[PDB]
């Protein structure tokens, strides 16, 4: 779950 | 197995109800990456109906402890502990998605036998009630006299609602 | 395994009653996909009668998080949650065979207890029952207040009729 | 496995009642071998009891859909949906052996509650029964009308009588 | 395993009652062997107290399809369509050791329903009662008005006496 | 396995109820072993209450047929069917230790009916009885008009005088 | 495993009722761990309710027995016997995070038949109170009698009131 | 596995109730130990309720049948036939932990049918007694008659009175 | 279920 | 179950 | 089973 | 859970 | 179980 | 369980 959640 | 990979990241998965089961894997899993580098930062994701207080209290002490900050993700639901452990992380990572939801209630239980016996039960039960309370404003922002109220019965609410009582600090769109 | 050649090539497969189990699984393998490509696609083929409202959710909220567009093709059976998923497909690129079947319907729950407990399951329910309706409109394209009348009871749909509906694109033949 | 031989060899298994996962695992076996090579013959050994609607046409919406060709063939029984995907095989590679039994019937089902929801399943189930004797008519060569008055009770027949019927292309014998 | 070994050398087991399960496995194992080798011939082991008409018919069909000569051996008992089974290997390759049982009967079923159900069933039950008893009277050299006689209650054969009758060929002793 | 060390050397264990399976893979051991070398002699314990006697029979008949001198030791308990294989050892080479403990009986079985079918297990069971007898005279070196009164009720027996009735050879100690 | 990972490091986890089983393999844990290097101080972690009294000895036993230092850290919940055996920790290395929920009381039991027979277990359970209250006596520090009337009835205690009772020396903070 | 790192030591864990499978195995483990090395000893851990009278005897007469020493130790419970077992070990060698707990009882069985049937089981459990009660008498020093009455109803002894009595030999400390 | 999925 | 399937 | 069975 | 525990 | 089985 | 078991 990136960016940012990595 | 999906989920050893999303670990080589620094991704665990909280997705069940909460018994010691969870609880103790989840534990050593923080403790695992805190060590493979204490700066790297690492991410929850949750989904679950909430369970044993005491198990959840296990995640909620690890998360503190470790060195690098914890962010968290709801995804689907974070009811009760759940919900506990997801106001829980790091301030400034708490995320929701679009369509998640989060419920705050009261610890519930049960007690049989002798006037005296079920006077033992409910005197913890009131007394672990008031410490996730004061926890729960401490995270949010809310005065304990709203955590307090605010609890007396299920509480749904929609993760626009979440950011709005402070459980969140932002929604994930694309 | 069979399904495991399937990930390898970019194919999810949701084949079973919705639950926060499959739901999980699914998270994370969109989100892995994603991340050894952002730019090919990644196709979900559907066959079950449905399941929990919050398992769903995410499935569907995740799906439009990642770059990689998200192609949907209902075999067999799309009940409930199912078809809705199903209808949550990329424009243009969600599919459904001959002689696969759509159903839609309205949520479904239970209440016991105190008057004011009862009250509190009623609006949640009918809550959710609102907020799947709105997304099914956008997606089909239908009016609101066609989507809350034809799901008062079950509604059974030929692929033919999935198609004019709005729920599917293309029909695969041959 | 001992199956998994088989598969080098482009043949696959339905020995078991028809149910969801079955087909969920048919379905990518024929996908699979067509991705390795479209233009090889594939095959599809039968002894089921028959099953799930919904699952049965799974399958038989997959056969068609890929290039290479699909030889059917019946060992032991091949009753209801059973007996169907049989005669779903490609023209003039149609199968049984020396004793094999084929059993045609109409649909089962049920409906409990009001009155408008009785209707509901009424409804539904006399549309399958329909669809799925007019598949029937194409593949065997009946008319139609001789199809409805047959299926209407549980109709046993013999290799024999499979063929004369039209279900098999051709007994194999030693 | 210890059977994943004789299949190296052509032996296959049936040991167990018979289900489509089992007679699946049987069938697939023919099949195996005469494709590496139609020339060496293949021995079936038989101890099972019988089972399904339909999926001892099954495994009957691929002994007489497939090249290899099939040697039976009835090790312990051999009832009903256990027995049938045994009376059908290669002709001068069926055996029996010395203190083996076999057991031959008329088939079981059941109806339950209006007139017209109990009818359609006594029919198919008393049809596969003949279709049994025709090819037993081949095997055999017993004519079928006397393998019904001698069936019609459970009637239990030494290997002496199912020498005489006609179900073995041969008495191994040391 | 453990076992899977025995069998290195030649050494098979029946230690529990003798029903088919366990008869199958006690069959399947000795001809391999007997098949590695038929020289060697084989190892076989026992420690078992007894169960099916065509079972037993099986395992019966697989020690007279192969070539391998199979030797007995009674490790625990051997009754009814497994007393019948201990004593079964080649002669000379029947083993007990010194608490072990031997038992044997008559037939026990059920019929459920009309006379006619009650009196066809009569029969059947009467004959099993009268071949197990003969074969226990024979072994042990008893008048069959003693085995027979010996076996009306329930006879247990410890080494020692399982020695002196001749179902064993020797009593290892050290 | 991710626990197979913390043998790796010198660390075991008791998280489970306390049974026979468990009981076992924690106890070979700490006899090969101290067997690499009896050295290295070892690490157990507790989040047990409780279980056999029997079993809960063996583990304190071999504690004390081994030459490692062995470490105890209380992790969400630690009752009954669990609370004993974090009690037996190291002095000075015994642990709890800042949740951690500590609960003690009185074995429990059960009698059935003649008034002799009650009479026998009834001391049984009452002997066994004894040599529990007397080793966490000499552990924490307070006199028999003090933890004699504290165990009448559930006595629930958290983190702190576990540090001041004298059942752990260190809270974990960050 | 973890027991297979103490079997590569020489020692062998007895931790659950006894019967005729967990009988086998241990005696298996014996046989292989000693053909390893005749002259390093062996060690048996035990830890168990008891069980099968005659599965006690098989692993007790193998104990005593191989050369190297077996010795024993008792840690949680050892009780009835697991209290005979440990009796057994190697004289000097028959330890105990500090908290262990023995127990010793008489046998336990039933009887029903006419008053020759009853009169049979009666015989056979009177017998059982004396045969234990005689070892155990040499084992510990105790005559006959003082083992009779002592087991008359259950008896249960501290690692002390265990000592005494004449159980064990030693108690590990530290 | 290519041409085109994938 | 070749002649003619494979 | 041999000789004969192979 | 270290520093200390290892 | 030797000396002798084997 | 050493010294003395091993």
Same mark, same amino acid.
């Given at each position: 779950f990136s960016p940012x959640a990595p | 197995?999906?989920? #050893?990979?999303?670990?080589?990241?620094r991704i665990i998965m909280l997705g069940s109800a909460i018994d010691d089961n969870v609880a103790n894997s989840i534990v050593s899993q923080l403790?695992?990456?805190?060590?493979?580098? %204490?700066?790297?930062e690492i991410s929850l994701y949750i989904? #679950?109906? &909430?369970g044993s207080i005491t198990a959840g209290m296990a995640i909620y002490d690890?998360? @503190?402890?470790?060195? %690098?900050?914890? #962010?968290?993700?709801?995804? &689907?639901? +974070? !009811? #009760?502990? &759940? !919900?506990?452990?997801?106001? +829980? &992380?790091?301030? $400034?990572?708490?995320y929701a998605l %679009?369509?998640?939801?989060?419920?705050?209630? @009261?610890?519930?239980g049960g007690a049989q036998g002798q006037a005296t016996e079920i006077e033992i039960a409910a005197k913890r039960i009131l007394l672990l009630r008031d410490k996730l309370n004061k926890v729960? +404003?401490?995270?949010? $922002? @809310? %005065?304990?006299?709203?955590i307090?109220?605010?609890?007396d019965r299920d509480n749904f609410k929609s993760?626009?609602?979440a950011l709005e009582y402070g459980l969140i600090d932002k929604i994930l769109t694309h």
């Amino acid at each position: 779950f990136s960016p940012x959640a990595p | 197995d999906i989920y #050893s990979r999303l670990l080589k990241d620094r991704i665990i998965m909280l997705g069940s109800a909460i018994d010691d089961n969870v609880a103790n894997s989840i534990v050593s899993q923080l403790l695992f990456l805190a060590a493979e580098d %204490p700066e790297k930062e690492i991410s929850l994701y949750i989904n #679950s109906p &909430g369970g044993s207080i005491t198990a959840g209290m296990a995640i909620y002490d690890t998360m @503190q402890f470790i060195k %690098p900050k914890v #962010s968290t993700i709801c995804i &689907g639901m +974070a !009811a #009760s502990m &759940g !919900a506990f452990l997801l106001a +829980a &992380g790091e301030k $400034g990572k708490r995320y929701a998605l %679009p369509n998640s939801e989060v419920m705050i209630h @009261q610890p519930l239980g049960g007690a049989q036998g002798q006037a005296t016996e079920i006077e033992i039960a409910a005197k913890r039960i009131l007394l672990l009630r008031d410490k996730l309370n004061k926890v729960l +404003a401490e995270r949010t $922002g @809310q %005065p304990l006299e709203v955590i307090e109220r605010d609890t007396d019965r299920d509480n749904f609410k929609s993760a626009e609602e979440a950011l709005e009582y402070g459980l969140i600090d932002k929604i994930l769109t694309h």
